[PDB]
Amino acid sequence: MRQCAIYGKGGIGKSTTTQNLVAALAEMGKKVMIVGCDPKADSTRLILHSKAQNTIMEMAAEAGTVEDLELEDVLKAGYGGVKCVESGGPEPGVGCAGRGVITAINFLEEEGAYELDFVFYDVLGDVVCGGFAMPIRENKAQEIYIVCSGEMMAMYAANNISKGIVKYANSGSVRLGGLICNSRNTDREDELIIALANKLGTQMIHFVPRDNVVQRAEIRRMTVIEYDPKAKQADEYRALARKVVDNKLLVIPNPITMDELEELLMEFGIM
Amino acid sequence: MRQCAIYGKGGIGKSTTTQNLVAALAEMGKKVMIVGCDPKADSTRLILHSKAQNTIMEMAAEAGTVEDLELEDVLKAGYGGVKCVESGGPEPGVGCAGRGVITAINFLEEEGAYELDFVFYDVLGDVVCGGFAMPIRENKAQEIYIVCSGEMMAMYAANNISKGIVKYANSGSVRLGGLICNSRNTDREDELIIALANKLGTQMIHFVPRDNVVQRAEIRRMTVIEYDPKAKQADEYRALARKVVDNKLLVIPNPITMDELEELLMEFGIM
Ligand code: SF4
């Protein structure tokens, strides 16, 4: 079993890319589990064809504690047999995202859900703090893949996630597997992300293009793999899945300074 | 002295709106202090004409601890006498973003920097956790203004911040003074934000349009008030400032559910 975490800032289609990648993995015969560690809890909608999956936090609140919770309600099987579970966001203004994530992971481990080829933690990378770095810090995810784009905020979040990895890459076995470039139809975006990965010492594992079929499948609460298996974007997600399966470059990144990031953006025509 | 917090998700120009509002306030004769509570620390650049102001956490690290710091290096005066502080983001992957704010506010209180007509805490509202809600929880900010837009994520963040205000309003005195609509050139965006404010039990205090002069001023690292005083956007920021000064409608919000927000987006042609 491989423990991978997809990190990245919100609003760039990270969850859709994660779900389509997991669907492509399931289509290859891999038993994949998705754990959504996002407060929005949108990391399992496409696999489950659901408007909203009941997160562990909400069901614990309805049942008092996670101790009186059942894995059958917590964990749901979606397309391709993919198991789906939502950690649940913090209480707005009160709790930590990290406490919800660790509670979900501990409940899953106690219930025996992990006993699978891949476990993907879809973790928010908008802010890189102790709470959102729980999978990295508690040795829950060993391979970190960052979904980014050719915009200042996306690469800044990627660099901060790399800083967190570097913090926990010593006295720990968590490594950066690569960068997934979610295209935003920006010119020289793939080249910019390749250069950013080279600066970080990692690779751009795959460049995910923008396609209308992604939104067409998302209207149906479905992945591109399930919706149109013969689409070109399905082949892109299959290539990403194969490159993640065959990924051997797991490195401790070298985070860049702010000036280097601005220089990269100037070089590739963003600012 | 009025203690206010500008909350809101990132990527919608909340920081620029806050800095222009503070510049318009100082242009009317009010003594304002900006406390930047975002980890990326861009809340005081346009006032100070700086690429990036040195944050409290950085100086604490360079000087060993906060107790070896001086207000001269921490507190900087920019355009119109506005006093600028950056709280300092957490160490990526380790610290909590809300304890840097605790440290900054405590240090400013010991240094006597709070004894001023307005204090504005620019607080990021991407994730509404116990850390990022420190000014609301610790009773440091009494009036909350949420900068939002017609996009789904901005309205979701506004609803979550309203939930936090509700949690801390039945025990403290923190209230929501209105919603600031940061236009994204979306059709029926002002009407949608007005409807959201009416559902929350509050008001859309001002509609901030999109203007190129905002970007022209930001390139020069200054606000529109200082760059082009005779511009229309400067007048919009002045209207927002005088509506903030004259604001008396401070309410405990009524946060709306997922279905209500989705139906609001459906009504005005966004979903
Ligand atoms: S550690 Fe991060 S998620 Fe947890 S309360 Fe602090 S800022 Fe919020």
From TrEMBL, chains A, B:
Enzyme class per UniProt: oxidoreductase
Posttranslational modification: The reversible ADP-ribosylation of Arg inactivates the nitrogenase reductase and regulates nitrogenase activity. The reversible ADP-ribosylation of Arg-99 inactivates the nitrogenase reductase and regulates nitrogenase activity.
SUPFAM superfamilies: P-loop containing nucleoside triphosphate hydrolases
Catalysed reactions listed for this entry: N2 + 8 reduced [2Fe-2S]-[ferredoxin] + 16 ATP + 16 H2O = H2 + 8 oxidized [2Fe-2S]-[ferredoxin] + 2 NH4(+) + 16 ADP + 16 phosphate + 6 H(+)
Keyword terms: 4Fe-4S, ADP-ribosylation, ATP-binding, Iron, Iron-sulfur, Metal-binding, Nitrogen fixation, Nucleotide-binding, Oxidoreductase
Modification ADP-ribosylarginine, positions: R99
Record text on subunit structure and interactions: Homodimer.
PANTHER family hit by this protein: LIGHT-INDEPENDENT PROTOCHLOROPHYLLIDE REDUCTASE IRON-SULFUR ATP-BINDING PROTEIN
The protein's name in its UniProt record: Nitrogenase iron protein
Provenance organism: Azotobacter vinelandii (strain DJ / ATCC BAA-1303)
